[PDB]
Amino acid sequence: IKHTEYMEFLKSVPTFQSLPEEILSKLADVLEETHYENGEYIIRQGARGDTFFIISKGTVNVTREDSPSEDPVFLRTLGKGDWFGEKALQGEDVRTANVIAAEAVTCLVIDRDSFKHLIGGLDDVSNKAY
Ligand SMILES: Nc1nc2c(nc(Br)n2[C@@H]2O[C@@H]3COP(=O)(O)O[C@H]3[C@H]2O)c(=O)[nH]1
Ligand SMILES: [Ca+2]
Ligand SMILES: [Ca+2]
Ligand code: NA
């Protein structure tokens, strides 16, 4: 039943609606569901990463420490259907920002092996810029 929940969810996200359903089925087979509570760091800037995240429940805050700043600066809030964690899967594997849960959060987490085959070629992901 979870495979179906995942498929139905992925087919509702515009970025992933562009993917053939057999590719979505393979993502649904391999993804892992992870759960967070408010204030929990999902990603820390400076860590080395290998996973991509799609928010299926809740919201997160994104912050980043820039070289000429002392303290991390708030960037944006993401919610259900949004995704993050792609930069460490594009080239160098370093995380470039913090991502912190802002309530009860569920993420669908995709590993590097699956991302590089099934997601990384999507233009919305490969050409993402902030
Ligand atoms: N550097 C940077 N990253 C942003 C930004 N907004 C988001 Br969401 N992010 C996401 O935060 C993630 C942290 O891990 P990552 O560097 O692997 O990918 C990042 C992006 O998906 C941004 O303005 N700058
Ligand atoms: Ca790594
Ligand atoms: Ca492409
Ligand atoms: Na990178």
Cα–Cα distance list, 87 to 7, 26, 128 (Å): 24, 22, 9
- Give the domain range for residue 69: 1-130
**Residues in the 5 Å CB sphere of ion ligand 3:** 121
Is 46 among the annotated ligand-binding positions? no
How many domains is the chain partitioned into structurally? 1
CATH number where 31 lies:
2.60.120.10
Residues 100 and 63 sit within 8 Å (Cβ to Cβ): yes
Is 11 among the annotated ligand-binding positions? no
Residues 99 and 75 sit within 8 Å (Cβ to Cβ): no
Query: Measuring CA to CA, which residue among 115, 95, 97, 102 is closest to residue 54?
Result: 115
Q: Which amino acid is residue 65, in one-letter code?
A: E
